[PDB]
Amino acid sequence: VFVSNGTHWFVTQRNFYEPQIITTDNTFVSGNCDVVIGIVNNTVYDPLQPELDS
């Protein structure tokens, strides 16, 4: 599931809390934000992004 403390957004397994920074690789794309009731704005991390500067 997704969760936040109130300042940092995270994803965690559903039966023992362990916050992961929300990377692409924790997640999958669908559609657009018009249809999902209660969706939230954020940034999602791309692990390749710094490697493009390297």
Place this chain on the structure above:
Amino acid sequence: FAMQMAYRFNGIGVTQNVLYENQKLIANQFNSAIGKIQDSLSSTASALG
């Protein structure tokens, strides 16, 4: 509750994007289906055999 149904779908091998992309329809489907339970139990005499 929608976040629960997104697990219920994930448990039958349906990826949960198919839930939220349909939530208002799935609500209407289930509300209507509960509606038929009144009629099924109320109108039929043999229903509790």
